Design a protein around this ligand. Structure first.
Ligand SMILES: [Mg+2]
Ligand SMILES: [Mg+2]
Ligand SMILES: [Mg+2]
Ligand SMILES: [Mg+2]
Ligand SMILES: [Mg+2]
Ligand SMILES: [Mg+2]
Ligand SMILES: [Mg+2]
Ligand SMILES: [Mg+2]
Ligand SMILES: [Mg+2]
Ligand SMILES: [Mg+2]
Ligand SMILES: [Mg+2]
Ligand SMILES: [Mg+2]
Ligand SMILES: [Mg+2]
Ligand SMILES: [Mg+2]
Ligand SMILES: [Mg+2]
Ligand SMILES: [Mg+2]
Ligand SMILES: [Mg+2]
Ligand SMILES: [Mg+2]
Ligand SMILES: [Mg+2]
Lengths: 105, 96, 206, 150
RNA sequence: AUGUUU
RNA sequence: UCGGGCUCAUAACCCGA
RNA sequence: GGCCGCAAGGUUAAAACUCAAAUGAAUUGACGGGGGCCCGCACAAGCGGUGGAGCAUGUGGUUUAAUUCGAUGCAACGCGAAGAACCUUACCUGGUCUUGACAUCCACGGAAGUUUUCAGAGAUGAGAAUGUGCCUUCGGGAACCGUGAGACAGGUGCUGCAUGGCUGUCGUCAGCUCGUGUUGUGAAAUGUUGGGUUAAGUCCCGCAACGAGCGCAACCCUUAUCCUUUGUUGCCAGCGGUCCGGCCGGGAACUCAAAGGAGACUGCCAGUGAUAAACUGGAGGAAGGUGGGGAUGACGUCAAGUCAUCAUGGCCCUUACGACCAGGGCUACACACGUGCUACAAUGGCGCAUACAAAGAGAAGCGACCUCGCGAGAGCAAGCGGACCUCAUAAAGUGCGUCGUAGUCCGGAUUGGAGUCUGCAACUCGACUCCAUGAAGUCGGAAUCGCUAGUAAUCGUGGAUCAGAAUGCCACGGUGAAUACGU
């Protein structure tokens, strides 16, 4: 982006540019962040259980959809649904946009 | 090494800087066909503890009578050890 | 010996010599002694002077020298007194009227031998090698260092069995030619033995 | 071990043109004196001329045909016992095997010069006789007598 | 087969 | 019995006399 | 002991004495004649060796007055020793000394010294003359010589299990870890495991892991190219000159030299492959897939080696384990082993003539030239401190005379007589030459080693150490293979 990749022949770029490639994808929502959460909301609660392992420790509010095989323990904010349902996948997900910006201002 | 030995050798050195320093030939010319007597060659009892072939080297730094280097004066241990630091101009580890 | 001398194979690049001049089978011989002789007497006295290195050159029938001391002041004394006195030592131990001078060494806590001779004395000074080398030695790190370390020897403390302590910070890749690291040693004769020191001070790569 | 190679060929016949022939000059060559090898592998055919007649080119390979094997065995250990399982050798090493065993006997003739000590075996093949040709069928002995294997 | 030695 | 080899080394085993 | 049984035995069931444990589950590593997977001249495929023979060299043993000491499976055994006649040199027999051979220092006398005399094996001892330095507010002092006296000095004496420093070793192996988080009571685990892939903990993918440090991959060297510049001692193409000799001028074109660069990077093409990495072919190029060879040797293990290089804790010797000299020994031998050299021969030997390299060496040095000598070499003496001269006259190879498979036209040990030289000095113990003598040996058992390419193999050349004794070590090039399915 900035005038820095101009160094090293037309090839090196790919090396450092590839590094970011993954970084961004993995560290998607955090770029702005620089401290800690406040109330994480995961999607596939059960499956993404390991993603809550850290939550249960601190105590950060946890909300997520739990199917019939989910683990209603880690999540301190019960809310079933379906980790599937190609159509209902965003349903409850949309009711979040409101709570956020379109609910705080 | 051994100071007692080092010194014992030092003697074997000064003597050359005396007898051999010049008188070495004062009899030499009278030794090879240059007629020519034998008296001098007979009463030849001046160079005893003195001989241009009885002086050893010993690592200048230390005093090891082995593993000496003319271009230097020390033995493998010191030389290498020193060269490592750089007490020798232009002596990088060779590697063709 | 697993690791060789990180300073040996460095006289070529990223690391200067210590006696740059010229000499053949004839002079090189007597010359090798000279550079030695001086550094011997000079050090003994320049001990408390905090030395880092002693460069030696030779323009013609005389040596140059460059006492790399972290505090040449002591080397001066009554202003010229001390220096002058020693300035004669060389002219006599060199065989020819040689010049002289110095170049103080700032940031001495980031110099091999300096730091080495530093931690080696603390011993006789009754100190805890560990608590010392992991502190009153690693200080170089504080100075925005890139990497450093020290590897003691055996007979550490009142032990009857030789050993070696670790403790290190940063990175000291004594394999990278460009890397460049400051190496030195000091056989601090311990009250009950003779421990050694090995300071690895890497200040930037190439 | 885990890598594979091709072959190490070199400058063929000095004039008669024949890559493989070089081997007969190399395999026989000793002390790295190929300069002399050409002095033996060439002068050899120059002597078999009157001996045989037809192009020395064929002359060689001709009798050579009665020296090259076509089936050998390789020791293979199994459950303690090491069988001598047979195996038909391809042409590549086949022709080679011959040359080796061929040049060998030639140097065991124990007469005078090699030029002749070489021609003898070069022709002894067709007419059948000598140490060289011996090995040829001699190898066949171990062969099949172990067919109970491969 | 053993090693403080089939 | 001895001399040599085999083994980390013995015995055993192999070679020689 | 009681009871049961035909019996074999069953059932009930102690004590003395002895130990500090015995034991269960699980963790880390290690190992297995457990499994899976994968590499390295490990084997397999080839070539050439060792043990055979003689000799050289080291070693064990043995011997001796001493045969100085250390080195011991690989990882000791042409190793410390790149150089033992004296010297070295530590060992021995004898001669001799006792603040010393080497230091500082106090005091006394004397500048230091010089050349000689005698006697001794010398170590010395006692002399004979001569030499008369620096300053002095004159005593004194600076060096230094001898002696006196001690504090001290000296010790290659012992502990490499007291140690530093250094090194070998697996191993140029790809490994070894750590911080944070997390799992477990814990020991620990994870990462680092796994799927591909690589020479590789190499790279990618995945994953309760996230990252990082040491290490492999780079920068250093060097070689393979091309350019730049510099052209002398190096170069010699077009020009002429020429005693026809790069010999003259001359020319800077060429090789060459040598400082700075150009270059190779899965960089590009195709296929395969997860459209991942990567792999397999291609082009272009001197050079392809870490180009080849160096150097570089992780955390560590073998209380691995070295107090004998030197340093050093302790310990020990103190008219001595200190010190000086002469002779002897380390160069023994009734044996055994390791590393080597030369042959057993015609892909050879000897006589002729002949064809061509690379890298280094050097003023107490390399030493041309010419003379004499069969010869080593000796005499004379220039040149070069060196792309200027000397070492330097490469050897295999090549074309001829030949000899004919003989123990010889092979091979060279051994020995006798005569000499050269390096050196005070070569009996003990030196290298070479001359003539005479000509060994064993005809290709080497059990077994065992090296080597994947300019390698192996063979042939020469130079260096180091060094007065003078390389079959060793280090390095250089000439020529110049076989073979590799496969684990
Ligand atoms: Mg001493
Ligand atoms: Mg000598
Ligand atoms: Mg038993
Ligand atoms: Mg027993
Ligand atoms: Mg158990
Ligand atoms: Mg290999
Ligand atoms: Mg094999
Ligand atoms: Mg064989
Ligand atoms: Mg001696
Ligand atoms: Mg003392
Ligand atoms: Mg040890
Ligand atoms: Mg030992
Ligand atoms: Mg022990
Ligand atoms: Mg890595
Ligand atoms: Mg590397
Ligand atoms: Mg001592
Ligand atoms: Mg010896
Ligand atoms: Mg020489
Ligand atoms: Mg020599």
């Amino acid at each position: 982006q900035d005038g820095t990749f101009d160094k090293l022949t037309k090839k090196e770029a790919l090396m450092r540019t590839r590094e970011l490639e993954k970084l961004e994808n993995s560290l998607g929502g955090i770029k702005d962040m620089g401290g800690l959460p406040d109330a994480l909301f995961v999607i596939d609660a059960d499956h993404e259980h390991i993603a809550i392992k850290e939550a249960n420790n601190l105590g950060i509010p946890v909300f997520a959809i739990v199917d019939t095989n989910s683990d209603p323990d880690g999540v301190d904010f019960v809310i079933p649904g379906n980790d599937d349902a190609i159509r209902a996948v965003t349903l409850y997900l949309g009711a979040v946009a409101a709570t956020v910006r379109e609910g705080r201002s | 090494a051994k100071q007692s030995m080092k010194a014992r050798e030092v003697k074997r050195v000064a003597l050359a800087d005396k007898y051999f320093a010049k008188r070495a030939e004062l009899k030499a010319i009278i030794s090879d066909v240059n007629a020519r007597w034998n008296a001098v060659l007979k009463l030849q009892t001046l160079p005893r503890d003195s001989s241009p072939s009885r002086q050893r080297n010993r690592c200048r730094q230390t005093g090891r009578p082995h593993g000496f280097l003319r271009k230097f004066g020390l033995s493998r241990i010191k030389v290498r050890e020193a060269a490592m630091r750089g007490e020798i101009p232009g002596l990088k580890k060779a590697s063709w | 010996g697993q690791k060789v001398h990180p300073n040996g194979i460095r006289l070529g690049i990223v690391k200067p010599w210590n006696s740059t001049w010229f000499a053949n089978t004839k002079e090189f011989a007597d010359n090798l002694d000279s550079d030695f002789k001086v550094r011997q007497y000079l050090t003994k006295e320049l001990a408390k002077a905090s030395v880092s290195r002693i460069v030696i050159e030779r323009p013609a029938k005389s040596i140059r020298v460059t006492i790399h001391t972290a505090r040449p002041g002591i080397v001066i004394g009554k202003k010229g007194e001390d220096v002058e006195k020693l300035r004669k030592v060389v002219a006599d131990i060199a065989g020819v009227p040689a010049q002289i001078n110095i170049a103080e060494v700032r940031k001495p806590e980031l110099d091999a031998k300096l730091v080495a001779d530093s931690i080696t004395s603390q011993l006789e000074r009754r100190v805890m090698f560990r608590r010392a080398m992991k502190r009153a030695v690693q200080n170089a790190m504080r100075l925005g260092a890139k990497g450093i370390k020290v590897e003691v020897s055996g007979r550490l403390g009142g032990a009857e069995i030789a050993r070696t302590e670790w403790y290190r910070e940063g990175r000291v890749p004594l394999h990278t030619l460009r890397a460049d690291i400051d190496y030195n040693t000091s056989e601090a004769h311990t009250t009950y033995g003779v421990i050694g020191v090995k300071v690895w001070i890497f200040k930037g790569e190439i | 071990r885990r890598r594979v190679i091709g072959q190490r060929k070199i400058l063929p016949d000095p004039k008669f043109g024949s890559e493989l022939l070089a081997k007969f000059v190399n395999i026989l060559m000793v002390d790295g004196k190929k300069s002399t090898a050409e002095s033996i592998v060439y002068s050899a055919l120059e002597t078999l001329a009157q001996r045989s007649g037809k192009s020395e080119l064929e002359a060689f390979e001709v009798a050579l045909e009665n020296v090259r094997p076509t089936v050998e065995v390789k020791s293979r250990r199994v459950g303690g016992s090491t069988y001598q399982v047979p195996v038909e050798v391809r042409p590549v090493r086949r022709n080679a095997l011959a040359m080796r065993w061929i040049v060998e006997a030639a140097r065991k003739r124990g007469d005078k010069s090699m030029a002749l000590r070489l021609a003898n075996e070069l022709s002894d093949a067709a007419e059948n006789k000598g140490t060289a040709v011996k090995k040829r069928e001699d190898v066949h002995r171990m062969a099949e007598a172990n067919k109970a294997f491969a």
